[PDB]
Amino acid sequence: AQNPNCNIMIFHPTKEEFNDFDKYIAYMESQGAHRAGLAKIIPPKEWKARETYDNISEILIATPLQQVASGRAGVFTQYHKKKKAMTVGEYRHLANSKKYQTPPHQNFEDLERKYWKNRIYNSPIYGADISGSLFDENTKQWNLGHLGTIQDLLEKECGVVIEGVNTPYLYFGMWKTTFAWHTEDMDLYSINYLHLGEPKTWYVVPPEHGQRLERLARELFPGSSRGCGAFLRHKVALISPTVLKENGIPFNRITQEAGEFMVTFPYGYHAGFNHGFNCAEAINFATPRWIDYGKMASQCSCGEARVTFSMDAFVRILQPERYDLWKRGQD
Ligand SMILES: O=C(O)CNC(=O)C(=O)O
Ligand SMILES: [Mg+2]
Ligand code: NI
Ligand SMILES: [Zn+2]
């Protein structure tokens, strides 16, 4: 069995290997990459996403979100307070302001220590889930707006034609902006490209051990767990690496830098934070191997999770027994 310790693997495809996306995901899995829940892919030196990032300042962040924490430094939740619209140029100036800018630090490990010590005492503002793309239309390799759609994959594997679309999303981050512990909708894959700016640190639990994380989370967030049997789908809970180690939870960590892709695998729980002003693009995707994970994905039906239009068909076809309860949580 490849990668039995579930380490995060890093890949360096050649320009030829970068042509066929599906084939390279299957190759990474042949080497055991999915066992980690997360892999890094460094593009060949010949590749670029677009020519420059000099002309992005007029993109609008319609609903910036202030991430307000509650709890203790290593075990906390966050809620998202809506703020007034602002452009990417305005957001970049805000991220660089004395109130929000990255502090002086020695290296990534020092900054990680500072994050976990001090995150809860600040409320950073995040631009999230902005439909759009920064890939040039002429970039033919690993262009996250030109991937095969999840609806087409389901139709190819299972024969059922369904409604829905699958488009990318942009993220604009600052120091201490935080992504809570979660798996993807319907335990899909994700891919994330860091277009520009400062790094993103990731934490991940191997898919084979995800239920260990879920059990700790029920212990640590006992009111939330009573409220909903899949409350991690709410995407509000944080647990630090120190707390995970104290509780024996298997996990790994890695820092993504600008120009690098990350792939998350089905049922790989992940969380992380941004180092300073940055912009990422991400989308969900599927392969044949996903279908069995989609069929078994937990679901939130309490009302909190609310998700895209295109999840309806996935639940309807893959999880007909759960569909009526889930749709009620949508309504
Ligand atoms: O960068 C982010 O805020 C979130 N990214 C992910 O959870 C992802 O691509 O799956
Ligand atoms: Mg612009
Ligand atoms: Ni994710
Ligand atoms: Zn719920």
Residue 11 in contact with residue 40, Cβ under 8 Å?
Answer: yes
Q: Experimental method used, please?
A: X-ray
Nearest CA to ligand 1 atom 2: 179
6 annotated as belonging to a binding site for a ligand:
no
Judged by its nearest atom, the ligand closest to the C-alpha of residue 191 is 1
Nearest CA to 127 among 166, 89, 99?
89
Separation in Å, CA 255 to CA 57, 116, 179, 229, 306: 26, 15, 14, 31, 30
Separation in Å, CA 243 to CA 74, 75, 103, 215, 217: 6, 8, 24, 13, 11
Nearest CA to ligand 1 atom 3: 179
Question: Residues followed by a break in the chain, C–N over 2.5 Å?
Answer: none
Contacting residues for 324 by C-beta, under 8 A, at least 6 apart: none
Angle between helices 311-318 and 150-158 (to 10 degrees): 20
- Please list every protein residue whose CB sits less than 6 Å from any atom of ligand 1: 171, 179, 190, 192, 200, 264, 270, 280, 282
Atom of ligand 1 nearest to the CA of 280: 1
Nearest CA to 172 among 225, 238, 103, 126?
126
Sign of dihedral through CA atoms 58, 198, 203, 78?
negative
Residue 274 in contact with residue 177, Cβ under 8 Å?
Answer: yes
Contacting residues for 175 by C-beta, under 8 A, at least 6 apart: 95, 100, 101, 102, 103, 124, 198, 274, 275, 276, 277
SS (H, E, C) the chain: CCCCCCCCEEECCCCCCCCCHHHHHHHHHHCCHHHHCEEEECCCCCCCCCCCCCCCCCCEECCCEEEEEEEECCEEEEEEEECCCEEHHHHHHHHCCCCCCCCCCCCHHHHHHHHHHHHHHCCCEEEEEEECCCCCCCCCCCCCCCCCCHHHHHHHHHCCCCCCCCCCEEEEECCCCEEEEECCHHHCEEEEEEEEECCEEEEEECHHHHHHHHHHHHHHCHHHHHHCCCHHHHCCEEECHHHHHHCCCCCEEEEECCCCEEEECCCCEEEEEECCCEEEEEEEECCCCHHHHHHHCCCCCCCCCCCCCCHHHHHHHHCHHHHHHHHHHHC
Resolution of this structure in Å: 1.2
**How many Cα atoms are found within 13 Å in the side-chain-facing hemisphere of 60?**
5
The span from the CA of 40 to the CA of 162, in Å, is: 32
| Sheet of strand 178-182, all strands in order from the earlier edge strand to the far edge | 178-182, 269-274, 200-205, 252-256
The span from the CA of 185 to the CA of 128, in Å, is: 16
Task: Report the residue among 194, 254, 264, 277 best suited for mutation to probe ligand 1: largest number of ligand atoms under 8 A from its CB.
Answer: 264
**How many Cα atoms are found within 13 Å in the side-chain-facing hemisphere of 138?**
3
The span from the CA of 228 to the CA of 218, in Å, is: 10
The span from the CA of 275 to the CA of 102, in Å, is: 7
The span from the CA of 326 to the CA of 306, in Å, is: 10
Distance separating the N- and C-terminal Cα atoms of the chain: 44
From ligand 4's centre to the CA of 185, what distance in Å? 13
Task: Report the residue among 126, 170, 178, 179 best suited for mutation to probe ligand 1: largest number of ligand atoms under 8 A from its CB.
Answer: 179
Residue 96 burial (C-beta neighbours within 10 Å; 0-12, 13-18, 19+): middle
Locate 309 and state its tokens: 């239009």
234 annotated as belonging to a binding site for a ligand:
yes
Domain-wise residue ranges, the chain: 1-331
The span from the CA of 305 to the CA of 169, in Å, is: 18
Separation in Å, CA 145 to CA 193, 218, 285: 12, 37, 11
Nearest CA to 193 among 98, 277, 257, 126?
257
The span from the CA of 193 to the CA of 65, in Å, is: 21
Fold entry, domain 1-331: Jelly Rolls (2.60.120)
Report the chain's C-alpha Rg in angstroms.
19
From ligand 3's centre to the CA of 138, what distance in Å? 27
The span from the CA of 295 to the CA of 285, in Å, is: 15
The span from the CA of 64 to the CA of 147, in Å, is: 27
Nearest CA to 89 among 130, 58, 131?
58
Q: Tokens 């040039």 identify what position?
A: 136
Contacting residues for 269 by C-beta, under 8 A, at least 6 apart: 37, 181, 182, 183, 204, 205, 210, 213, 232
